[PDB]
């Protein structure tokens, strides 16, 4: 999966 | 000058309405107009700017990824020779995405960053600069790929240095900066160990500072800490 | 002429890529270009045209509804007088939506409908004409509201008359036309009894014809029949 | 709720 960054969406 | 005839306050009001209507292209144009009025942005206004462009570029990035995957499959041995259309259309989306990144970087350079003296604003804008160079790096393949990567790194590094001196380890901007710099290391700089070390240290130093926070601040900080944990779980 | 230099087949190929990338504005522009080549559209190409514009206008309609609701609340007794911004922005979105509807109606009038002689194509295009006049009617408030409503009704009625003569009661285009004409009656024409009668008769006549169908056609028809049932459950 | 039309989305 792709990693989470901030902000989301 | 696109929005040059509209009042600053009306542009901010309409950006908020556009957010509610999920009209993020409009939201970004309203916030660009507000920036171009030349006044500094408040905390709320900075968040509106960030939300607007993150959603615009987010859709472009997702589309680019779909098209790049199709293009890669078309260039595998045994693939029937399609024409130039997949490459052409991937290039179209890529150019649009690059234009959005250049627009954001332009607002930061003219003149948001130079006017930003408080830690919260300066870190926010330097994080944004790192983020939009990171998005350019995701699609870069030519002579300037290394320089784009270094521009992202340099912006993130200046933001990190300020945040460590001027903000507590639980500050949400500091946490989101560290989260994204860690993603930069993993996905862009081919430095997974640096990515993991940064995420772990950031998480642990925030954990140790939660005791100082109110219930509402605790909620804000732990939300981003969970994203650090999610990445560490993906990467280890 | 926006797409005048691109091959018809390349425009169709790129419309399919745009669909996969969820780039519906691009998809609609590619399909507009394909229509403007002047050749009739195949069944697959008609569906691409419909999907593209339905998704574009669908986002506009949803945004218009959010903004109209905010505007209505701002015009309730006890509401603090905000400025003109909510109305102005609702008007902006409304004008954009009207422009998309006018574009589709223009393609149908120049010259898709007049060249469409087979039942499947002619019913499809007349349904589309009714649908886009229906979307105009959803936002109409002036002297022409009644004429817009009658234009939707007239298009749907011609499509219904052809579909009843030339298509079996389970034909998916016939079913989707009846579904949408029933929504027109309920939501636009203030005729809930007509809406319910049409949905019930359509459902029952399709039920009685399912025995003639293959497994795959049965799946296609029962999917739309379920939408008729869903509306009847909402309305009764 | 708003009623269902076709095609969806
Ligand atoms: Ca002013
Ligand atoms: Ca190791
Ligand atoms: Ca040709
Ligand atoms: Ca009755
Ligand atoms: Cl082959
Ligand atoms: Cl293209
Ligand atoms: Cl009041
Ligand atoms: Cl406006």
Q: Which of B45, B37, B91, B98 is nearest to B67 (CA)?
A: B91
All residues at 6 or more sequence positions from B25 whose CB lies less than 8 Å from its CB, including other chains: B56
Chains B and C lie in contact, requiring 3 or more CB pairs less than 8 Å apart: yes
Ligand 2 centroid vs B193 CA: distance in angstroms? 6
In this complex, the residue of B18, B63, B86 whose CB is nearest that of residue C23 is B63
What 3-state class would DSSP assign to B124?
helix
Query: What is the Å distance from ligand 7's center to B17 Cα?
Result: 20
How many residue contacts between A and B have a Cβ separation below 8 Å? 33
Question: What is the Å distance from ligand 8's center to C92 Cα?
Answer: 5
Query: What gap in Å lies between CA C6 and CA B191, rounded to an integer?
Result: 43
3-state secondary structure chain B: CCCCCCCHHHHHHHHHHHHHCCCHHHHHHHHHHHHHCCCCCCHHHHHHHHHHHHHHHHHHHHHHHHHHHHHHHHCCCCCCCCCCHHHHHHHHHHHHHHHHHHHHHHHHHHHHHHHCCCHHHHHHHHHHHHHHHHHHHHHCCCCCHHHHHHHHHHHHHHHHHHHHHHCCCCCHHHHHHHHHHHHHHHHHCCCHHHHHHHHHHHHHHHHCCHHHCCHHHHHHHHHHHHHHHHHHHHHC
Q: For residues B95 and B176, give the distance between their C-alpha atoms in angstroms, rounded to a whole number.
A: 27
* C92: nearest Cα among B185, B105, B226, B17: B17
> Which residues of A fall below an 8 Å CB-CB distance to B?
1-9
For this entry, resolution in Å reads: 1.5
Phi, psi of B119 (to 5 degrees): -55, -45
Chain C partners of B66 at a C-beta cutoff of 8 Å? 20-22
Angle at C126 between CA C124 and CA C132, to 5 degrees: 105
Residue B186 Cα, gap to closest chain A Cα (Å): 9
CB contact under 8 A, A4 and B179: yes
Ordered domains of chain C (ranges, CATH): 8-236 (1.20.190.20)
Tracing tokens 């008769």 back to the chain, one arrives at: C201
Query: Nearest CA to CA, how far is C93 from chain B (Å)?
Result: 10
For C146, counting Cβ atoms within 10 Å of its Cβ (0-12 exposed, 13-18 middle, 19+ buried), the class is exposed
Question: Assign residue C78 a region: left if phi > 0, alpha if psi is -120 to 50, beta otherwise?
Answer: left
The alpha-carbon radius of gyration of chain C (Å, integer) is 19
Minimum CA–CA partner of C70 in chain B: B17
Which chain B residue has its CA at the smallest distance from C87's CA? B14
Decide if A6 and B187 are in contact by the 8 Å CB cutoff. Answer: no
DSSP code, position A4 = P
Protein residues placing their CB within 5 Å of the ion ligand 5:
B 80
Measured between CA atoms, how close is C142 to chain D, in angstroms?
A: 24
Residue B203 in tokens = 């998480």
Closest CA to B123 of B53, B197, B170, B175: B175
Which residues in chain B are closer than 8 Å to C63, comparing Cβ atoms?
Answer: 21-23
Q: How many Cα atoms sit within 13 Å of C235 on the Cβ side?
A: 25
Coil, helix or strand at residue B82: coil
């Amino acid at each position: 999966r792709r990693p989470s960054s901030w902000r989301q969406e | 000058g696109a929005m040059g005839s509209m009042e600053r306050a009306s542009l901010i009001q309409k950006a908020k309405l556009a957010e509610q209507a999920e009209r993020y292209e409009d939201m970004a144009a309203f916030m660009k107009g507000a920036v171009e009025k030349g006044e500094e942005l408040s905390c709320e206004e900075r968040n509106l700017l960030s939300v607007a462009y993150k959603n615009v570029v987010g859709g472009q990035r997702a589309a680019w990824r779909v098209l790049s995957s199709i293009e890669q499959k078309s260039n595998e041995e045994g693939s029937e020779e399609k024409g130039p259309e997949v490459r052409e259309y991937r290039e179209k989306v890529e150019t649009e995405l690059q234009g959005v990144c250049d627009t954001v970087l332009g607002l930061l350079d003219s003149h948001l960053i130079k006017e930003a003296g408080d830690a919260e604003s300066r870190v926010f804008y330097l994080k944004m600069k790192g983020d939009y160079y990171r998005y350019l790096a995701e699609v870069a393949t030519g002579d300037d790929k290394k320089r784009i990567i270094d521009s992202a790194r340099s912006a993130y590094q200046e933001a990190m240095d300020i945040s460590k001196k001027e903000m507590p380890p639980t500050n949400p901007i500091r946490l989101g900066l560290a989260l994204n710099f860690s993603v930069f290391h993993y996905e862009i700089a081919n430095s997974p160990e640096e990515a993991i070390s940064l995420a772990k240290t950031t998480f642990d130093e925030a954990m140790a500072d939660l005791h100082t926070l109110s219930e509402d601040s605790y909620k804000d900080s732990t939300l981003i800490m969970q994203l650090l944990r999610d990445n560490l779980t993906l990467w280890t």
